């Protein structure tokens, strides 16, 4: 029933990098998703108290959302792009474990996984 604290967006002793792929990720890919008409249920952490889904965090052991992700981008939290790219995979994957296919929240996810996959087919180069 209670919510856990949100995944860390800061960490002083994690190694950090502003790689150019990575700033594509925040500047194009995240904001390409961030403003899609279905981004809202994902712009922050799932709230099992307001939604009254107590079972959520018993099922979902590694929450991700775009809220923490955008922060992590703005926090140079990442070492490269694979890291951030798999913070998206878990965001979706959680939605496909917790819910069952056909659910409206599954729809929107799938919609966003595909645009996300569209915007991360082409990524800029290195310096």
Ligand X SMILES: Cc1cc(-c2cc(CS(C)(=O)=O)cnc2Oc2ccc(F)cc2F)n2cn[nH]c(=O)c12
Under rule CB under 6 A, residue 58 binds ligand X: no
What letter does residue 98 receive in the DSSP assignment?
H
* Piece of 9-17, 38-46, 71-79, 116-124 that binds ligand X (CB under 6 A): 38-46
Q: Which position's Cβ is nearest ligand X?
A: 104
Closest contact distance (angstroms) between CB of 66 and ligand X is 10
114 sits in which H/E element: helix 104-119
**Who contacts 91 (Cβ-Cβ below 8 Å, separation ≥6)?**
42, 64, 65, 66, 69, 109
- Pick from 25, 46, 64, 81 the residue near ligand X by CB under 6 A: 46
Closer of 62 and 121 to ligand X (Cβ): 62
Which of 16, 104, 114, 124 forms a contact with ligand X (CB under 6 A)?
A: 104
Does residue 51 interact with ligand X by CB under 6 A?
yes
Query: Cα–Cα distance between 127 and 118 in angstroms, integer?
Result: 24
Concatenated DSSP letters for 32-91? HHHTSTT-GGGSS---TTTTT-TTHHHH-SS---HHHHHHHHHTT--SSHHHHHHHHHHH
Binding mask 71-100 toward ligand X (x if CB under 6 A, else -) reads ------------------------x--xx-
Beta carbons of 113 and 123 less than 8 angstroms apart: no
Q: Does residue 41 interact with ligand X by CB under 6 A?
A: yes
Site residues, ligand X (CB under 6 A): 41-42, 44, 46-47, 50-51, 53, 95, 98-99, 104-105
């Amino acid at each position: 029933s209670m919510n856990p604290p949100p995944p860390e967006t800061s960490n002083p002793n994690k190694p950090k990098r502003q790689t150019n792929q990575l700033q594509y990720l925040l500047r194009v890919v995240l904001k390409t998703l961030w403003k899609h008409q279905f981004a809202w249920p994902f712009q922050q952490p799932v709230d099992a108290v307001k939604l009254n889904l107590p079972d959520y965090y018993k099922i979902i052991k590694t929450p991700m959302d775009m809220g923490t992700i955008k922060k992590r981008l703005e926090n140079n939290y990442y070492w490269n792009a694979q890291e951030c790219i798999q913070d998206f995979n878990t965001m979706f994957t959680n939605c496909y474990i917790y819910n069952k296919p056909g659910d409206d929240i599954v729809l929107m996810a799938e919609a966003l996984e595909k645009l996300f996959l569209q915007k991360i087919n082409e990524l800029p180069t290195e310096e």
